[model samples]
Target: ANTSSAYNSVYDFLRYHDRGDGLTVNGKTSYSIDQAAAQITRENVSWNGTNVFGKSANLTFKFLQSVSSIPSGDTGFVKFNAEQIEQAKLSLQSWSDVANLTFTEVTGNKSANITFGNYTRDASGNLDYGTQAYAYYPGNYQGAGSSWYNYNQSNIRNPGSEEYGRQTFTHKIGHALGLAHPGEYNAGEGDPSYNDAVYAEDSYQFSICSYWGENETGADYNGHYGGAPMIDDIAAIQRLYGANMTTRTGDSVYGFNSNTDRDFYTATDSSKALIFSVWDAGGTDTFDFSGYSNNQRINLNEGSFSDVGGLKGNVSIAHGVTIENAIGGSGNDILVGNSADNILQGGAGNDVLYGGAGADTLYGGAGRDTFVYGSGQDSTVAAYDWIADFQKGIDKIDLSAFRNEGQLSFVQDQFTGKGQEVMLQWDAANSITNLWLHEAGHSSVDFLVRIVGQAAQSDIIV
Candidate 1:
């Protein structure tokens, strides 16, 4: 059986998840090489190679041999025969030959770099269904690698179907190396959304994986064995770890030891574009980009990974990451911040700022925009700052931060009229439209806000 019905060589559709009928198969994959490589931050066992100038030597793995035993009190795990072990090794070999990775199996009592085994459990002594096999992404600097394998306890096992057996391990091993479901980022498996995910990961690429062959039938997808290490899969591992940098006669440095900051005109323009991978590990690691030009972006992380400490151009910042400061160019930009305090400035064009987790200060230099204050206890009010421009009906203070809170709790302005500024607080001891958050234990911060442009009581949305 294939990992999903959408997969199996017999059907060769968009091999993602839960694809039961043909209703979803539009029959196309926007496979990308660079994009797929970006989302693989968690998969690196050792991404610290000094530079991307050379390929890694060899990666190793250890098969549990003709026996299997999950440690004491462990859930469902099974034993494997010699053939099963060999077939699994073959699946691994398929990738070894394609990417910069070289897998070598070792013997002796040494702690195997990565120990493969069969496992299935529901924590209740019952068998867990679904998922052919799963493992942690690559780990350890020396590739101490994580564990992975097909459960002999499941029905998708090698029931004389060598083809099925090979792929079972192959697909799981893909995760082992660091490839997310190339299908897509937002959608689960085997759906149009998944195709979008793949498109986001692979940026610009032709057909990413093997499509269902013209004359192919369900048999081909099932086990006449369409094959393993599909093109998209190969490109993914290679893009992350890389077999070798083909063209260009030499090398260059991209960050840290290379430079304090980096520029990403395009995905592969430099390793820093993959900055999300190691940005915080060291250096002030600043980044400059035109991310919003095409808007080919996704920030599952609100911005805790402030790798791109600074961004520009017409763009929408992905959620996640606590930024110290960010500046937007003369285009409409959407800045999303994490639970960390940030300073978002919109230089030109209408922009929308979201201070998701932590308290943030914002500025709309030009054009009317929205200052979103999504209230949450995830961040502290101490040292919190909220200031900006364009309020009066021109711009609004989004109190969505206190969505559940009833009406506006304003801090009657101390100074008002003509040239005077307004200081409004939320749910605090102050007074509506602009007052401190008066929740029980909420620490009140004195946000001396609303300078020239301030919103009116009629414009507050609690």
Candidate 2:
């Protein structure tokens, strides 16, 4: 399906997310690939390779075994618990899956490139519970890669089961990996508003590094945060350490029947909410939101949003990624497809299917469905869409979106030079019906939809 004109594709997503403020971890310097990459930090800290070139770096991480073993800790620093360690690994894996960085866990006296620990005291040796967590940016310093969490906070202690806890880990890791908040302000810098943002979409809806909430940017996540790198985060990290094209290269399914193993992408029941942007390298993918009873709008296009599982603008496909199919839930839903050939299944409800710019196969399963066409380019003669089942009386083929071209009239045999005309011709030999539409400017019929079953002029809605 097509997105709004603002930022539809990957190029637009990248262009809009970058603020060019430079990273402020150790020091401030510009590393923006124009305004095309997100808020990047000063140095590209790699274990090997020059920092200026931005190469793919192999990194190592370790959970602090004891607070006394590390000299960078203050008075009340403590090691991460087992649950926190597991959740931190998942958060790091989510980043590594999208970018070209490799992460290996280190132990004992081996110095890791990144370290995770908990702290309960401020720099002055006083107990501090106000601050949730913080992490230093990547640099060549003593405490550069160390991420400190408030030991008294419940979210950091049992992150594996808590949504905000996992999100906290991912956000801090973004800081450690040379990403800055989209705005200039930070914690203890007074109450900052969306007015301080560099761009309108600079909230958590775009990047996890943003201090603003998703609702501030007109995105509703249903009170759930994404556990993986978001749309802008993917673009930003890939800018720093190239895109990993080898991730999820096999056929995968997300949502109710999810097999990706990532918690953010799976939805077990209708009550469970999914809030994340998808990033896949290669393979046929499907968004199966069949378990939800909510009226979902599932779009398979890249850089597009899908309102799924009772959440508005929550599910999204990342830039440069193509999901092949979408299965709508029981409620009356809307399913749209991209340029790639898609299979859209409208399950058990009156649904609207728009096979936008693709030779798609649509299944209006057990409902009075409507197939909408906005433009002649939606289905060309070369690559026309196929309607698997068309109930002539119950279902409708809506060409009303072309009302601007003039009212579409159903013709019997041929067009009478009418600007907007629709005709259905039956192929007795092939047992198929061809629904043709002749637009105002085009001399010949330009749009074609092949129907498997019988269809008549009664099914056409002008």
Candidate 3:
């Protein structure tokens, strides 16, 4: 009877309308985010690039059918405040932040493909009640209307409720965009529901988010008000769109886009940077640091980037793309620190080697490869790095760099610093035992090459 309350007939109608998770919604077959995640992983965007209901990681269909000529303030809903609009923008930005999607605010409405507005029923007065937000599952699927959103109290403007609402954009918008909760409903909260996988895993390499689990069952908010960053979330979303380097730092495992050839250089910041991971569908890729005129170190992962133009980053190189090759620049660099078994060669200058994440076939391919303890680029303090492939008298460990940084010189495999208090002090065991470079006295960072379990003193030189 009332449309004034945020939780009124509008949600009531949605909670009971077109329900499904690979089940038949409105007599049509549909799948949840995890259902696709659980069974298959294909982005598979529709031919028209308009279908938002399918499950394909390789496809790019999770979209707003129509975009305005310019960024619109906030359309469809009148209750959204300025900050609320920005908060929702955060979620909107995440799509663009991690993928190639964009949500613009327009000056006009008819120019929009997907429109949003406050509601209590279908425009023709067909539905109403119980849904926080509901979106059409891709093209009218009937050639009639485009997908849209129904957001009210769920908006992210409330103070004590910002985090909850903030992440709501991520989760609910996920559903609107193209993701579902896979599990039985009314099964958890005993409330009116369908298949809600709130208790199960979400996405981004199995990131731990219980929003869907608890939300459907109506159990715990526990700080997980909405979708926080998770590999599982990234993977789930990326599966449909592409690589989300925005979330590619250290929190999760990543790969490249197998859709095309990509060359990664350096940028001002990764705000709008595009990086493909091996995990992407498939593609040819290269990491080029030759552009940097100054010395630099590039970690395979974007998080360890140290310099300006010539990049310095680190990566796991453990999954996704199959054919990934790299060329280091004039500056000393590190190729990879992979665990899934890959090739790494140090290109020019004095470099580092990730070799493989687990074992290795280290080629001192230039100045690239190293048994790297961590990225030597950490500015605040010194971290240890090793030569993944040491040739006794050939490969040098920069005993020069560690010389005066702390309690310099070698230890006889007896100096003990448990839980990582070991630095600049060398713990020699390489004789399967080699040398361990421990930076002592504080920001102590160390690395140990396990040939003899210690490093050869003779092999150590400037």
**CA lDDT scores, all candidates in order:** 0.42, 0.78, 0.38
Model 2: per-residue Cα lDDT over 161-267, one tens digit each: 77888999999988887777766777877788776666555667767877888887456877787788877788778777878999999888999889999888988
Q: lDDT rank, highest first?
A: 2, 1, 3
TM-score of 1: 0.37
Lowest lDDT block of 10, candidate 2: 2-11
Per-model TM values vs. the true structure: 0.37, 0.88, 0.39
Writing each residue's lDDT as its tens digit, candidate 3 over 145-213 gives: 222334445443451254555555555455544544433331126554324433233222132222333
lDDT of 1 by residue, 209-300 (tens): 32223112111121133224543454456656655323111222222233322221123332222222211211111223323231111121
- Quote the lDDT for 17 in model 1: 21
lDDT (C-alpha) at residue 253 in model 3: 18
Backbone clash total for model 3 is: 114
Assess the local accuracy of residue 410 in candidate 1 as a C-alpha lDDT between 0 and 100.
47
Ranking by TM-score: 2, 3, 1
Candidate 2 residue spans exceeding 4 A from truth? 1-36, 40-54, 68-74, 417-419, 428-430
The better-scoring model by TM-score among 1 and 2 is: 2
Clashes of each: 50, 2, 114
